[PDB]
Amino acid sequence: HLKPEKLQTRFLNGSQNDGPRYPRCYTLTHSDSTGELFLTIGPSYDYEQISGWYTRFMRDEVLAVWEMDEEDMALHVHVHVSGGLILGSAKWRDKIFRQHMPLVLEAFRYGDRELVKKYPEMDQAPILVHFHAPNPKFDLVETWGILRDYKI
């Protein structure tokens, strides 16, 4: 489980804690030196946060995008299981991301909690997780419940 006091939240221009609902993207990284999680909420992804040779080599970020559909919205989450010149085998990386996915989704719903309060319908929205890999074995899109399931 998530430790709220270890979660820093930043907003990109065009996004605030009260909206808008769309466009709305999440960028999530961490530091194993401090154990803290860093969440940016914005119209798109946080390119400062995912910059530098380190994150390009570890590719440990979690990105997410709220997508409009006919039944309100859905959250599309993305993690880089394999591909390119990165640390770790596809099978390790897949195992660690799956391990930490409940923590990831808890950070999204704690971090953006004011918006859930304002629009309780997002808290029923489905969560779709795409484990990206070149290999069909690991390239999987999965439903991981809804947002209220990750209430802390």
By CB under 8 A, name the binding residues for a copy of itself. Answer: 67-74, 76, 82-84, 90, 126, 128, 130, 133-136, 139-141, 143
Nearer of residues 62 and 133 to a copy of itself, judged by Cβ: 133
Nearer of residues 2 and 105 to a copy of itself, judged by Cβ: 105
Residues 6+ apart with CB under 8 A from 75: 64, 65, 66, 67, 108, 125, 126, 127, 128, 147
Nearer of residues 37 and 77 to a copy of itself, judged by Cβ: 77
Residue 77 beta carbon to a copy of itself: minimum distance, rounded to whole angstroms: 12
Residue 62 beta carbon to a copy of itself: minimum distance, rounded to whole angstroms: 18
* Rounded CA separation 82/64 (Å): 18
Tell me, what amino acid is at 70?
Answer: E
Residue 35 beta carbon to a copy of itself: minimum distance, rounded to whole angstroms: 31
What is the C-alpha R_g of the chain?
15
Residue 128 beta carbon to a copy of itself: minimum distance, rounded to whole angstroms: 5
Collapse the DSSP code of 66 into the 3-class scheme (helix H, G, I; strand E, B; otherwise coil) and give the result.
strand
Structure token digits, residue 9: 């939240």
